[PDB]
Structure 1
């Protein structure tokens, strides 16, 4: 009842490590083993489609655009906190990256279940996550930089 997700750099195409998924009494824990990322905090969310391929938007290329928007099984249409109910179900706590480009700090998402995650995609963004649609939509994550399909 724990899954391994391989993460890939959307820009370089090379592997970036993995994230272990575990179920617990208080929700789902995400334990990262990543490297080759930019120090700081990164928006981190479960996206809708089981894909990390690109998509297209207004004549331009959208890296990782195939995974669609944030996981939102209740159709809230809003972006928020991991412990608030009226916003995407796939909104997770932000992912911290060390000075050396490494990510190893685990996070908890109390509202999710391991079972429902299968076939979805995990995304890491360039930007941070303010857990609001203001002043920048979707918490200011911006571009997608790393992706992996939950098998």
Structure 2
């Protein structure tokens, strides 16, 4: 059970690499092979809808907005950690990008199964992720910068 997800930069429209998804006894491991991202920690989540298209809100374009919100099959309406249950099941560990713009550090989501991920989107945000809705909603990820649909 391994899936390859192609990731595209939402602003440039160009490919930025792939993430390999694998099932193990401890959860789903996301192994990135990405480039052209800003150095530092990036919010990283499964979103509800199988699209990376834009949406609009109050007359403003939202890149990657068609993916909807964080994947939340238990209707928690809360953003949190990958190892806490009363928040979005889509909440992954943050994605690290090296000084050279590459992301290669794999991370584990203990609460997810690979089977439930088909048809959802993987999102990488501009900001980081403090795994809280304070002081900024949704961990402070802010804008969506790269996205791919899980097939």
TM bin, normalised by shorter chain, reads over 0.9
Shift of 1:66: 0.1
Shift of 1:98: 0.2
Q: Partner of 2:142 in structure 1? A: 142
- Tell whether 2:33 aligns with 1:33: yes
Structure 1 unaligned regions, length at least 5? none
Q: Distance in 1 between matches of 2:101 and 2:20?
A: 18
Q: Normalised by the size of structure 1, how large is the TM-score?
A: 1.00
Shift of 1:116: 0.2
DSSP 3-state at the match of 1:139: helix
Q: Distance in 2 between matches of 1:70 and 1:141?
A: 12
Q: Normalised by the size of structure 2, how large is the TM-score?
A: 1.00
- Aligned Cα root-mean-square deviation (Å): 0.2
Spell out, residue by residue over 1:49-104, the C-alpha distance to the aligned partner (whole angstroms, 9 max, x if none). 00000000001000000000000000000000000000000000000000000000
Shift of 1:48: 0.2
Runs of 4+ in 1 over 4 A off after TM superposition: none
Shift of 1:11: 0.3
Structure 2 unaligned regions, length at least 5? none
DSSP 3-state at the match of 2:115: helix
